[model samples]
Target: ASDEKRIETLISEIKNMFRCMGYGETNPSAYDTAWVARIPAVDGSDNPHFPETVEWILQNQLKDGSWGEGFYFLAYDRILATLACIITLTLWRTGETQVQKGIEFFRTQAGKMEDEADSHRPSGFEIVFPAMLKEAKILGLDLPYDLPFLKQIIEKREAKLKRIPTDVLYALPTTLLYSLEGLQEIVDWQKIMKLQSKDGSFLSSPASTAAVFMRTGNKKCLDFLNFVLKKFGNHVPCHYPLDLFERLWAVDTVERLGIDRHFKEEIKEALDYVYSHWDERGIGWARENPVPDIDDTAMGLRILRLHGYNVSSDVLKTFRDENGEFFCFLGQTQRGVTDMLNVNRCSHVSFPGETIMEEAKLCTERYLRNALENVDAFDKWAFKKNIRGEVEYALKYPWHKSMPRLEARSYIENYGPDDVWLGKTVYMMPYISNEKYLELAKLDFNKVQSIHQTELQDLRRWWKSSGFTDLNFTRERVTEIYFSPASFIFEPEFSKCREVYTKTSNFTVILDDLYDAHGSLDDLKLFTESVKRWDLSLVDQMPQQMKICFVGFYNTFNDIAKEGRERQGRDVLGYIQNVWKVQLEAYTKEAEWSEAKYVPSFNEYIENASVSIALGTVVLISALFTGEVLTDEVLSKIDRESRFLQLMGLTGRLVNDTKTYQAERGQGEVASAIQCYMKDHPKISEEEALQHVYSVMENALEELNREFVNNKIPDIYKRLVFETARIMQLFYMQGDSHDMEIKEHVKNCLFQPVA
Candidate 1:
């Protein structure tokens, strides 16, 4: 009960966290702020334009006289931040002692610059630092510009400049635009002005834009600087107005941490904020920035579409080049793991017949696959993220199969509040990465796990008393049955929903065993009829084993529907019975085809196999008990708009058939979809048949996505329809997690509490 109160408190606090979020908070950059500080008085005085910004510089130097994120040390950030601060203070002829200390700090760290990896260096360090050093020399500050490491960086900058002539720089919005401040005397401010982003900044970079304003004194540049100064006061982030990236990532984090329900209103507002600024050319880190990148676009598209926003998948085409390679942004020197990972995730939500997503899926899949093989070649965003594990999980369990609770459980362990971001400086976003989020998630997960454990005990007791244990022919998958419902419908109040789904699912598995491996054709016919009649007395003619299976299935579902009427005020017995009849009859048809060695046409087999999978029936039954008043109109709409259910069933059936078909063929069951497809297309090899089945699976997913985004369908039911397919993929993806292989998954999500 105390834990309940504690969770309530955390929920309230995080709600405020979401409500108060703005352009999304980030650690202040000393380098960026110092650049703003150097703006001379626009009123024509020689004094600094923003004295408060200069005062900010005087106040925030670390004890070592370095100015950067104090929590983590990268010599490049320290030196760059220190250099910019010293340059500003020296130019204004103030903070004399601070400038000397900054110089001393730089001198001490000059050798360490070469020790750091090139990839870890802040963006444009090679150009920007040398420019700062040149300015420092012009100021007659005593420093080590003659150092060998410094000279090597200078030579690299010269080499880079040689590769791109000044005309090329001015004509295009290249990475060079992000470092305009470093170009100094060589740049034509007039030419560069044309390349500034719509927000009047260079690539949304504060430091670069500030330097441009100082050079050109243009009103537009000054306006951009003023806007940033008003929002950040004395200090500014390296990247301003990273609003879209911030909101998308923040919503994603809260949802993945399993605390999103508490912030439903806030989550919607956040998503609405993203949808408004979303672009056809895709979006970048910020809303109004003229450039777009795959990293933010893919994330934004996925989140917006998942929330039922009307977004087009065609926006992804902007990121793909002629060869079908997706880049993070134009003129990018390299691609990182996060970029492809987001694209892969976004593609999973594509509607039917989106060729762009089809291309992206193949490209990203290939990229991530290659990345995994040579883990060492993975980029520095790879630093502490165990990105290898994240990539493998995504590839192994695509988005549809990643159930909410399972993903949340994995993410809570993987989330690192201290994970630093690489930018023009090493920094962190407090709103995105916070210890409070991790602390609350751990507490909530452990608290919820305790509730799950209690329910597991109750379920075990029900299992023993209901006599399902007597059905020895059925697979002993008690935890697996509970795990599916428990993982999907895993809120505290939904225990009734979880129980109903679990019991119904367990009965279907029992019926599957009876129809597949155990009963004779005659015995199967009798048992199927008794189940259809929903009467225990009708099972009298069946053998003892069949009678036990029939009675257990009958009693369990009856108990579930009875409780629904008693506790939930819904008498769903007839509705649940009808769905079960449809499912069982489909199983009977499959059994008949198998007994006669009849290879039905592929379409006919898939039609029966879709219902035979029983996922749709189990999902519908679970929905009946979730306390929604399923009035006649709602139920009628659901029955008429059953495309999602049908597609999901077909996807599940094909997924199961392909993965289990070889074993089933060995078991003498040759009427599965895989075998049926080959029979229908006589010339295709088995490999071609397997490939054709997977393509059809993709087609079904795309069609389900079309229905998934329909405005008329309630989000809750869409998830029920969607997550059922996901559970199928999860169960059979890498060789049947439903069997003994699921032990680890169950233990992680169900048995163990988060530490």
Candidate 2:
């Protein structure tokens, strides 16, 4: 309570901090500092722009002659960090002894790297390290090139250069833009400097631009490097002006941490800075760079769309090449796991008729799936992550179905400390990958889970005392009942609506089982009519003990209508009653098929099955209670908004069938989408039919995205619609993640409080 000078003081301080382009601060890099010291006088050979950078190198050597500032030891980082600094001192002819110590450290550590598994190496180190080694050789230094491993390492540098066309490399900002510190004169300065980012660096890279400054005498390059010197003195980070990278990730980090509520204004500011630099081609790792990367663009699209911004999905167009593959940067040597993941994520936001996204969804999805199979797919950022598990989790839970809290739970565990971005040198985005966000996210999720537990118990008592439990289809379905709203509508303001939604979901699941599995045809027929009836008076037709579900359904809709009357000055129960009637009609129709052992065609099944899926209805009704505020030229617009609801429902249903239908069909149950498709094309295996269903699911998502962007939909309701899709897809990802044998999601994500 006494931590601050005033109650509003912290907010004021935080608000001010948001004005900066970068998030948190980063430390100096021995590698970057070493390069800064290398800039010669453009006019003559007398002096350097930042002479103190040379002093930084002299002062910061490790005990073993290495130069990495941080305590963490990655032998390659230390070796690479050590080599460049030694070379700088050698060139300066000032610290001859320091130079000797550094070469000794690199040779000893590097020879072992040749013998050990290739771990913790900086990206492009083969080219840069060998290039630096040749200079050390020219300076008459004794290096361990005769080591068999060293011979192999040098060969990789030669291979790295061959991957890119020299014309493309020099004329445009490719991956070659970052490591120019190692290359000799190449590229016309006019063409090369055109790729300059808004901050004046080449991709926010100190070494790359310093190398540029050496050739072109570009003052902006000097200003960019000078900007670092002014703030950080002689030592500098691997990159600077990393505003977009920091801001984009902080939105993810802070929100997942569950502390975004406190930083809403700051989050907005971070986005404001980012989109200010946003362009038709999308943003690069930093602002103003002529070349943009899929990694930064994908992150930008998501964060922008998540907030109220209507960013163009067309920005992704720039990353696609004719090869039918999405590249992070033109002529990149290989793909990073996280780069393609973002591409997959951003595709979920595509509107209808965005054919590019249909290709990309499969493109990125297949790429990520293979990454999971292959042992390791690395990230360019210095982030430590579970690449295999991260991809598997993503494939298991696409954005349309991923729950925020559940994802946060997974991401916190997956997030590694000091996310070291591989660039001109290894660097960290400190604030974007910190413990504070994880700690707060856990605490907040626990609080929500605690409240959720209380709500669950209340629901359990209602189910039991009201004799709903006596129906005997009960599978102790509290988690199944709780997971939907615990996933979808979780804030305190929506508590009433969340409880109502969860209860409604559980009521339906059990009711489904009674018809689909447990009950006789007579039982299915009776419940179907009861569900078809809106009146509470019909409750008497069921057995005295069996009145619970009818009563539950009657109360749930009536309660929402009761809230609606207060909130809207009229009851929407009549309008909403029709919604449940359609679902029950669809369900009853399906049960009839099961009773007769009917197999419907694909088109025939989708016509009935789409309405039976309940997630979007949950979304619409939650808005009714929570004041998501939908007033319309057509409150039930039959245009694209209605189509979005229909397509989304079908998509969710198909995703559900893809996972659970085969197991469900063991009893000759109603035709799920896959089975329906198989009936039409008898020759294809279930695996082949499943892939076709997935294609339509992708098409449906595009339509959903298009409809969502229509101006008639309120921003909040649009988001709710997407969240419902996310909840449905994820909930069904591995066969009913909320229900089925998927009980552990709740136990792990919602029940267990993390330490």
Candidate 3:
């Protein structure tokens, strides 16, 4: 059949279905279905043919007045049908009599169903009731005593207002507004204003402002309207029907108030500026600095027409494609035919073919292919994925810090023209190479002022270099990043040092040196006494490395406390006290043991004794925080020397696991590895280890990913995880060890694992 004949047949079939179903009759099932189909088919569009279908359905009404199989079968459907028939007839020029009859039928049915035993009130009766009333008014039809009935309902609801649930707030305001509008009464404007959130947006309901505006022409209503318009006008999506209506209303209000008059000259200038950038033929939008939408072009065209400007015929012709879809006429590629099928890619579609199923399929496939190709290239080079069979070689024989001159050169080349590559050019200069150590030397004096301050600056610099480009190196960043952790460590006094120190047996030497320098427990008392007795400058004159080492130790302690409190609800300050007492007790015992052994030099005895004590302290702290205690038994299993070296081994294992997992899973190798490795390693469960590693790597990878994806990390936590991974790698590498065997192991497992 021809297209026109097919369309005619479809229309007739729909009409016949409505008649056979007894739509207006009190046959609940058929009546409800007929109404459902009729409303959508008519209200779905502004088609002039909709009135005929509506008229046919209304003609089949039962004498009892309700349309359904049973009196109470889906009463909501009946109410809705009543509302729809009323609205449809009101909009139809020839259906004035039908419109009046529909209103009478609705009013009578509403009275009959007011408190009917089996009646089911519609979910949003307030809005539905008022909306129907408004439709009747709009159609210039009178309801028999329906006005009094609505008033009675409103009064009854208002008296018991406190009992009304908050969920009903949206419907109440909408219904009340419509009710008040019909009654010609002013609404409580203040109540509506109070309902608005701090963001100047309403919650969930569009009817909030609509209610106030329909009752009172209050300035707050205008302000609220403007606020919503500006919000939507900027970038945020407002997804309520009321918001859209308000936005459209505001545009009209702005025009009516002559607000545009003040910016008339500016608007003209802006229009001229925009027009100058018009592409004219490609997308029918300006090529440079395109506005967010093509709707602007339509507005611009209307504006030009309003001003009686002699716009070119081609400009008008360009607005519509051959199939008559609108095009972006003012923004990028002005006057160009927009890609009709890609709605998100471009602001406009020029023809009907743009939304067609066949066109969509082809467009989707092409878009997918292009996206995949781009991702493939990006993964290969940008992310350094070894797609050229070099994975094994690269991993087994990894490039040293000093090697890869060509890679360094490429790194330098990759730097933006405006970017500074310090190591390549600035630090490579002979004077800089020789004197950069002087910059390092100055760090000592800088620390004397405040060790925390010096560390903050260094950390900030590293943070910036690692790609937190948006962070400003200010006191705020320092306080935010460091103080919370520090406060958690130092503020509360909880555990005795003995209890704290006995938990682990790793990093004993480093822990002892750190404690001795930093002034923990009675050492803090001694340091305070020393400062009071002698010149403060004497303490300030300590070695730079010693001060830095002390700072690092303090920071590590703070990290332990913070992590403990955050993850396990442990009191960090209490943990610190316990650690200090434990260390002091161990030191006293060691001194006694040394005297009994008749050690020659006090220093020699202390040095040998402190190593084990420090290792123990490190283990205690690790267990208290990360729950990963590197004991002698644990280290004996790994070939790394010292607890510190063993910790590096664990980190290496983590990295290897991550890399292998990623090779298998395609992404998030480290996280996946942590999951797999932790399965058998009960000390570090999958969730705990993954989360800990994730915290550090988040920031590192976030920086890298921002550089990789050229987009900001959406969430801060994810960024922290990326950074943690990078930091772990950096710390592991700082130890003087060749991890060639581990690297080879990772390579073999990743690329050539035995089946």
The lDDT of each candidate is 0.81, 0.71, 0.34
Taking the tens digit of each residue's C-alpha lDDT, what string does model 3 give over 1-755? 75345434533442342223210111112222222222222235654322334445456444545442232234445555555555544554445655556566767666665555343243344434454455456666666535566666555544444454444333322223222222223234555555443333233222333334434444454354344334333111111212112222122222222223323443454445444544333212112211123333333433442333333323333335454444443212322111221221121111222233223233333443444443332132121222111222222222211112112222222222121111000101111111222222222212222433434355556444434233222112332323212211211221222123222221233333433332334333332233233324333544443333334334445555665666455465565545455555555444444334332232343233333224333333434432333243543332123333223323433443344444534532122334433544557665576565554433333233223122222222222222222333432332233456434322322222121
Q: In lDDT terms, which candidate is top?
A: 1
**Taking the tens digit of each residue's C-alpha lDDT, what string does model 2 give over 392-466?**
667777766677777777776666645555554556666565555665565566777788888878877866765
Off by over 4 Å in 1: 165-168, 331-333, 373-384, 517-520, 566-570, 637-641, 735-740
Tell me the tens digit of each residue's lDDT in model 1 across 438-485: 878888888777888888889888889877777778766677888887
Candidate ordering by lDDT (highest first): 1, 2, 3
What's the residue-level lDDT of 141 in candidate 3?
60
Best-matching candidate per TM-score: 1
Report the candidate with higher TM-score, 2 versus 3.
2
TM-scores of all models? 0.95, 0.82, 0.22
Tell me how far the alpha carbon of residue 660 in candidate 2 is from the true structure, in angstroms, after superposition: 6.5
